[PDB]
Amino acid sequence: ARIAGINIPDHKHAVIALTSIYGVGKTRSKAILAAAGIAEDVKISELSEGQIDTLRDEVAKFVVEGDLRREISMSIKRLMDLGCYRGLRHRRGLPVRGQRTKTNARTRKGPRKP
Amino acid sequence: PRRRVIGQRKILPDPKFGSELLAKFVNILMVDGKKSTAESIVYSALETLAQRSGKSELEAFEVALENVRPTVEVKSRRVGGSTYQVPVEVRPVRRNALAMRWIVEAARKRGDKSMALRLANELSDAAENKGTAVKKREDVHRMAEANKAFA
Amino acid sequence: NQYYGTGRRKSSAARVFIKPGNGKIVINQRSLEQYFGRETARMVVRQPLELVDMVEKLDLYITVKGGGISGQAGAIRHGITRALMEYDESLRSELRKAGFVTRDARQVERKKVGLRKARRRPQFSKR
Amino acid sequence: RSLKKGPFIDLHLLKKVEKAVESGDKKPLRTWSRRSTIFPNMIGLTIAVHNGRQHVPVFVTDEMVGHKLGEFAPTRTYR
Amino acid sequence: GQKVHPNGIRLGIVKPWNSTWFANTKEFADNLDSDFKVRQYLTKELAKASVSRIVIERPAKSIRVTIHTARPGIVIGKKGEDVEKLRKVVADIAGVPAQINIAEVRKPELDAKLVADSITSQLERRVMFRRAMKRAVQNAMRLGAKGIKVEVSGRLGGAEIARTEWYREGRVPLHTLRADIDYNTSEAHTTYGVIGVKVWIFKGEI
Amino acid sequence: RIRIRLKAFDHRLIDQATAEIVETAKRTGAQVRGPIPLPTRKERFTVLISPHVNKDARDQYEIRTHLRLVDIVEPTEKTVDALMRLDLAAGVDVQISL
Amino acid sequence: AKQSMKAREVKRVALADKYFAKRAELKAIISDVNASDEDRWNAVLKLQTLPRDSSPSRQRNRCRQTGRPHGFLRKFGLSRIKVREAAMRGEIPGLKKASW
RNA sequence: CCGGCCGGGAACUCAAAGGAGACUGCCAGUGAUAAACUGGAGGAAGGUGGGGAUGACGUCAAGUCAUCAUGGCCCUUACGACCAGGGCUACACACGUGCUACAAUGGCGCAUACAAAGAGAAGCGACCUCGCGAGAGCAAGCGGACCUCAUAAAGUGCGUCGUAGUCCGGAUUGGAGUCUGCAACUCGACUCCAUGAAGUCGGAAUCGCUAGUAAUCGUGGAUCAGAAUGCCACGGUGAAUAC
Numbered sequence A: 001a002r003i004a005g006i007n008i009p010d011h012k013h014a015v016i017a018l019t020s021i022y023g024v025g026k027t028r029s030k031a032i033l034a035a036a037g038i039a040e041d042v043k044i045s046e047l048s049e050g051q052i053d054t055l056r057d058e059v060a061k062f063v064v065e066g067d068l069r070r071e072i073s074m075s076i077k078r079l080m081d082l083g084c085y086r087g088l089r090h091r092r093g094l095p096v097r098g099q100r101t102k103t104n105a106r107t108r109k110g111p112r113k114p
Numbered sequence B: 001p002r003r004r005v006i007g008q009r010k011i012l013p014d015p016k017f018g019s020e021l022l023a024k025f026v027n028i029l030m031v032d033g034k035k036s037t038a039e040s041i042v043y044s045a046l047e048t049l050a051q052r053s054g055k056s057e058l059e060a061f062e063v064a065l066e067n068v069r070p071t072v073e074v075k076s077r078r079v080g081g082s083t084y085q086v087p088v089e090v091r092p093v094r095r096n097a098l099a100m101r102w103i104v105e106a107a108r109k110r111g112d113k114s115m116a117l118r119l120a121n122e123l124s125d126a127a128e129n130k131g132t133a134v135k136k137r138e139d140v141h142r143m144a145e146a147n148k149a150f151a
Numbered sequence C: 001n002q003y004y005g006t007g008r009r010k011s012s013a014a015r016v017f018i019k020p021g022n023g024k025i026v027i028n029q030r031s032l033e034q035y036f037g038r039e040t041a042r043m044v045v046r047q048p049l050e051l052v053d054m055v056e057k058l059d060l061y062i063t064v065k066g067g068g069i070s071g072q073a074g075a076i077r078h079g080i081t082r083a084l085m086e087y088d089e090s091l092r093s094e095l096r097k098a099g100f101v102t103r104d105a106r107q108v109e110r111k112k113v114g115l116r117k118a119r120r121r122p123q124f125s126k127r
Numbered sequence D: 001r002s003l004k005k006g007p008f009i010d011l012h013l014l015k016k017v018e019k020a021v022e023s024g025d026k027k028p029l030r031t032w033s034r035r036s037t038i039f040p041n042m043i044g045l046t047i048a049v050h051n052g053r054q055h056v057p058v059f060v061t062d063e064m065v066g067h068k069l070g071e072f073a074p075t076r077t078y079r
Numbered sequence E: 001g002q003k004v005h006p007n008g009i010r011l012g013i014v015k016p017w018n019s020t021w022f023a024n025t026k027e028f029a030d031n032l033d034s035d036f037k038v039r040q041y042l043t044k045e046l047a048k049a050s051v052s053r054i055v056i057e058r059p060a061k062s063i064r065v066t067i068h069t070a071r072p073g074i075v076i077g078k079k080g081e082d083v084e085k086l087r088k089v090v091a092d093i094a095g096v097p098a099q100i101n102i103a104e105v106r107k108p109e110l111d112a113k114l115v116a117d118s119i120t121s122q123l124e125r126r127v128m129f130r131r132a133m134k135r136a137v138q139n140a141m142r143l144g145a146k147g148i149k150v151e152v153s154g155r156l157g158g159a160e161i162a163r164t165e166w167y168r169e170g171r172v173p174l175h176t177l178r179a180d181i182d183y184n185t186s187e188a189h190t191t192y193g194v195i196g197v198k199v200w201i202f203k204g205e206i
Numbered sequence F: 001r002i003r004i005r006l007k008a009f010d011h012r013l014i015d016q017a018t019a020e021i022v023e024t025a026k027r028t029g030a031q032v033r034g035p036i037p038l039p040t041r042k043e044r045f046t047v048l049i050s051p052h053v054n055k056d057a058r059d060q061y062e063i064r065t066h067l068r069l070v071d072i073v074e075p076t077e078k079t080v081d082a083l084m085r086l087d088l089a090a091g092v093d094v095q096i097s098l
Numbered sequence G: 001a002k003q004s005m006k007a008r009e010v011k012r013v014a015l016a017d018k019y020f021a022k023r024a025e026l027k028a029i030i031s032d033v034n035a036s037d038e039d040r041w042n043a044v045l046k047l048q049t050l051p052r053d054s055s056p057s058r059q060r061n062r063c064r065q066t067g068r069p070h071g072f073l074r075k076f077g078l079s080r081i082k083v084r085e086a087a088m089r090g091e092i093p094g095l096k097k098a099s100w
Numbered sequence H: 001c002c003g004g005c006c007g008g009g010a011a012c013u014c015a016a017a018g019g020a021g022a023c024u025g026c027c028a029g030u031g032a033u034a035a036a037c038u039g040g041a042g043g044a045a046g047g048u049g050g051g052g053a054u055g056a057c058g059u060c061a062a063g064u065c066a067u068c069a070u071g072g073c074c075c076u077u078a079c080g081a082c083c084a085g086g087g088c089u090a091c092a093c094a095c096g097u098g099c100u101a102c103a104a105u106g107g108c109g110c111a112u113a114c115a116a117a118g119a120g121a122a123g124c125g126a127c128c129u130c131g132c133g134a135g136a137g138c139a140a141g142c143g144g145a146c147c148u149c150a151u152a153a154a155g156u157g158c159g160u161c162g163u164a165g166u167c168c169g170g171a172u173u174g175g176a177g178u179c180u181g182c183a184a185c186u187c188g189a190c191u192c193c194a195u196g197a198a199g200u201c202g203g204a205a206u207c208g209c210u211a212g213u214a215a216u217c218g219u220g221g222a223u224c225a226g227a228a229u230g231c232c233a234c235g236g237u238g239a240a241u242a243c
């Protein structure tokens, strides 16, 4: 309801709110509720704050919103520093997940201009 | 094909209570070859109709079967080229499949809960004539009311 | 005493044995509702029995395998037709009228060259 | 990615810089072994990465840590 | 390719095999190359001695090479010195012991390969191809043949274009899968070009 | 004692290759066990008869390799003395495994 | 079919199995979970001198008579359009055409 | 020691062969009593009952001299020969095949049921050990209805999710890896963690299909050191019309 400072995962199950949290995904929520000692069958609207602060303390061990994009940007600045092919391609605003580029990258390369 | 004039196959009756209509009722909705779950959700939806109608299933729909079933369809007679409606008598040998077809097309509708809850509510809607397959009957009646005495 | 029911329904070998005296139906040392009492073909394993006698006169001992759940549940429907032969004529002429005694020689067609399935042609272009 | 045990270094790329770590390498090097990566010893070089039509002189900063020579070679001319 | 070889579909049915031996797929290709290269060497060694057909067998790596000839007088030579010399080279190229056996044909007009070799010797001399075909077909029909289909194709007689010519005299069942027909293919490369022959002869029915 | 495992191509060849094994072992060889069908493998594949063009042209070639068991059960000496160095119905493969 | 191609298969196969392809104690025993001694380099030191003429991964594993990289099959030794012309000519033991 | 594991039977599931039986075999009839056909019992099996290889004179002088072949021509201290490296995967942009999709006849979790066809000796590898998984050690066993690849999947029971791009769906990149073969980025695949679109079942137009077919959900082979949704193949579930 308040975790992470900004995100309100209201009416989300205990681990579903953590999968929907900004920074982590599918298994880290399970890992958090296992390291904290909570089950995942009820929404966030039933667990009191006596444990929500503990969930927020336990998630303070990973990279969070403010450092997530900034570690990504540190890597991207390493790309703008080196000059390698993934810096060249990334410095032209091109799609994001592999190697094939010629015929089918149209969603993230945008529709055809002319 | 152009040569042979054969008809349809034999219809397997249902082992619970023999109903060709019900069998077709399921096999028109059948999808993808996964019939185990379809059987899990249709007979469960019909023993749940057994209370929605108060009586059994073969008579649950006979009060509404007629409502789905019209007297007319269209077949274009060509006297130089035409593509609009020309009314003709609908065949009863397949009017059953037509009636079980449009009501499952309507059963895909009303979608908020799962399948079994909604298709039986649609059966009640044809019992009290509040379905869109019930209005399809008047729609084909309108596609027949216009051009009479064609051929 | 002991009478055998054959079967080969849809690549599913039916091997049935019938005894007189009771009405138990055990599928490969497992019971009716343990395996498929509420599943596909839940009653055609009795329809041969429920055409004449099922509940307490004749008890069954089935071992059908080699396919899918539906194939195993139909292998018995066809095995009991061959098992009910202690009154061969009265059990065979009664059921041939309704069927259930044919083999249903249905074999899954193999992959045919070109045809991307048993019958599907690869997609055209025309142009 | 690459090996679990030992990064793949060619012997023509490795040794030419080994004894010149002592001296300074004085110059670009005619590298025809673009398939190997960089370790602290090779930082500061003006090496000539193979690219076909020519060999590109590339300065090796300390930031080129876990990367191979064949990656920043202009084989993708594209105008 | 509308017409299949009218023996490849009748091989293991009515007609004899030609590479008759059992083994496993660890030396099989080594047996195959040794068979092919030595078979082509023997057809390069005994062609003028008329080899109607050659059969290969590998029983327990003591192979049997059977050579069906029409003129064995020049095959054996002086009491078998040529054959005892040949037993050496086949075993050299194959690496396996070889038992070579000559077989005989009385009338050489029973093999389509043996007459196709005659056609190959015919149409490489600037001779009338009709005088070859129409003559061999009557020479075969007078001794007996319930069906014969002889085809010559290509540059025949200086056609300068693609042309096929066939002489069909009798019942040639290239579809019925109960009969026995002999058939083989040959080419003759004159200065004009190659000339291909297809010789079908139906004698046996069972 | 001689587990005889022979493998051959044809059923009208392996039958006449097993006839001699099962005949010689009764006149000399003390009541062999018997032959079992022993289902077979046929190596079914589709090999490209294709030339540079026309992928849709195929061939479906196979090799039918028959499988049979004999299993002479008794360790009789005249069995091995009758089955020392004989090979019949060429086109087959036989072995003498104790 | 090129003379040089068909000889290039020969120059590789004459030495691959004559060399490190069987002389392979310095192939896997050196490359293990053992000490991170010079061994990690000593693996590559020999291979830098070794030609890429001799490695199991290298050769195309094709037909012999043709010289053609395609059409070959692992079990035969011959390309497709030659092996079929010998097949239905009869020169393949027990190979014939059946159907289902 | 409810593992056919141990005696035992050689009934049986099944299996490789030899046969068998399906045949218009009989009957009603508009009709040239003909032919046959809708068709009835019989009938494990109804009309070529399954399906397949099988392509008839040939045709577009269709494609192929880069599968191979071999005239004719040409070059031949070069159009021959050899090494390293890049390319074919470069990309404003068309189109042609297919998987994933465009959620609730559905998604996630425990649980749990059954295939047939294949492959396996310079090759597969039970078992045990480490790991979330990928996969690394030890490595008996099989050139094979015995040992293995290899645990089939949708399924069945059940809980939850309940309409928002939401537990739908996952891609063209980040970060850390895992194997292969000298060798993984220009150029291999795979696993995990992190971000999360398009798209809300569609226009012109157009394609596949007469059954155990379509649709389909897993499996294996080939090619191979590695390298597919594809090619070819196995089987599970299982429709619709044919006026």
Ligand SMILES: [Mg+2]
Pocket (backbone or CB within 6 Å): A093, A094, A095, A096, A105, A108, A109
């Ligand atoms: Mg892009």
Ligand SMILES: [Mg+2]
Pocket (backbone or CB within 6 Å): H062
């Ligand atoms: Mg053309």
Ligand SMILES: [Mg+2]
Pocket (backbone or CB within 6 Å): none
């Ligand atoms: Mg169409």
